[PDB]
DNA sequence: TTATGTTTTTCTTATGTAATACGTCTGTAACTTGTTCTTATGTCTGTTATGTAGTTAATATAATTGAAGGATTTTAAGA
């Protein structure tokens, strides 16, 4: 499965890495590989697409057995957008009091 | 005796972890602003009450109205 994101971004499940490509399976302009928690967050946001993803769902999926201080929620989804280079805050959207969403262009299965 | 492979230790970095501080989005409120329906009222008009002006041909030809045990003093008009 290949998820397409704005600015011609791609996250791959046929592999385990993110890139800026115009060819789905071809590794063009590699970003790298997200961490375990980053990959889990990206998977959760892509699965809840096109619906908004609730905050409690994210915290109980990323940290099933962790006493999260309620502020790692924002540091994590700040550096996740930074690692995808979302300087304009357009790649991942926050709808207030409803949750988060990630802008997916197309899905390749 | 000495060169070298190894293993353990310590330093360096990386992902997460949290704390406090401050900006954004959004939810309510103050301030106006346009539109439509309603209402009290000022004004015009018709109808009836009323207020005014006029006329009437035996003859008839100088009030009235009390008013009633007042004393005392002052001052103008008559002679």
């Amino acid at each position: 499965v290949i998820y397409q994101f704005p600015d011609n971004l791609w996250w791959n499940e046929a592999s385990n890495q993110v890139y800026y490509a115009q060819d789905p399976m071809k590794p063009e302009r590699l970003i790298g590989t997200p961490s375990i928690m980053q990959a889990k967050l990206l998977k959760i946001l892509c699965e809840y697409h096109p619906s908004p993803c609730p905050n409690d769902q994210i915290i109980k999926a990323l940290w099933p057995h962790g006493f999260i201080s309620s502020e790692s929620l924002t540091q994590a989804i700040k550096r996740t957008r930074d690692f995808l280079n979302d300087e304009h805050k357009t790649l991942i959207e926050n709808v207030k009091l409803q949750g988060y969403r990630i802008n997916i262009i197309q899905v390749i299965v």
Side-chain angles (χ1 to χ4, degrees), chain A residues 5-11 17-33 82-88:
Chain A
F5 300 131
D7 307 322
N8 294 323
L9 181 68
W10 301 87
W11 186 73
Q17 45 153 339
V18 200
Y19 36 104
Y20 287 104
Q22 302 88 28
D23 201 335
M25 210 282 174
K26 172 176 174 177
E28 299 186 0
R29 182 180 171 186
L30 293 165
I31 297 188
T33 53
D82 208 11
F83 162 85
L84 318 193
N85 266 20
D86 193 15
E87 294 170 341
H88 301 291

Side-chain angles (χ1 to χ4, degrees), chain A residues 10-88:
Chain A
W10 301 87
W11 186 73
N12 202 245
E13 331 198 274
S15 325
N16 258 346
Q17 45 153 339
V18 200
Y19 36 104
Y20 287 104
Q22 302 88 28
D23 201 335
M25 210 282 174
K26 172 176 174 177
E28 299 186 0
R29 182 180 171 186
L30 293 165
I31 297 188
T33 53
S35 147
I36 300 168
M37 285 326 210
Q38 294 195 24
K40 283 179 180 156
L41 172 61
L42 280 175
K43 176 157 180 212
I44 293 153
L45 293 176
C46 288
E47 184 290 344
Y48 266 74
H49 207 58
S51 64
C53 187
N55 289 337
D56 71 305
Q57 193 39 259
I58 306 168
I59 76 92
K60 292 179 179 179
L62 283 176
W63 296 279
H65 311 296
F67 301 92
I68 281 306
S69 290
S70 76
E71 42 195 346
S72 79
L73 206 29
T74 59
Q75 222 90 52
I77 322 194
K78 161 213 209 330
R79 310 133 84 230
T80 310
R81 276 142 92 181
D82 208 11
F83 162 85
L84 318 193
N85 266 20
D86 193 15
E87 294 170 341
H88 301 291

